[PDB]
Amino acid sequence: MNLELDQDGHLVDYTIWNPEVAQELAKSLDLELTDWHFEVLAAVRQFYQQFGHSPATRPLIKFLMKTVSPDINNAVLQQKFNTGLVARHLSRLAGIPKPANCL
């Protein structure tokens, strides 16, 4: 798969995302996506569609709690996504740009 990526490794064009593209991006985390991840990534894309930018760490967690499940928190996301860089990689795997203040 030959994805068109920006300097951060995020999709240039969020509209070409699909579950196979998400899995391609998740390979760098040695992460096999399941429906659990697909539902979380759908909410990340919903945030982007509603508000036009990628969510930062705390707003991302709050939005997932409201939209997906109150049981989602940073620790759960870190475990399920194989990374402590939750805002960065949730946006990346959802096909949206890097949140502005990430390194």
Domain-wise residue ranges, the chain: 1-32, 33-103
Please list the residues that pair with 87 across neighbouring strands.
none
Tell me, what DSSP letter sits at residue 15? G
Resolution of the structure in the document, Å:
1.5
DSSP three-state, residue 93: helix
Method: X-ray
Backbone angles phi, psi at 33, to 5 degrees: -70, 145
**Active site annotation includes 20:** no
Q: How many CB atoms lie within 10 A of CB 88?
A: 19
Q: Which of 52, 89, 102, 103 is catalytic?
A: 102
Q: Name the residue type at position 97.
A: P
How far apart are the C-alpha atoms of 64 and 14, rounded to whole Å?
20
How far apart are the C-alpha atoms of 9 and 36, rounded to whole Å?
23
Element (H, E) at 23: helix 19-26
DSSP three-state, residue 83: coil
Please list the residues that pair with 11 across neighbouring strands.
5
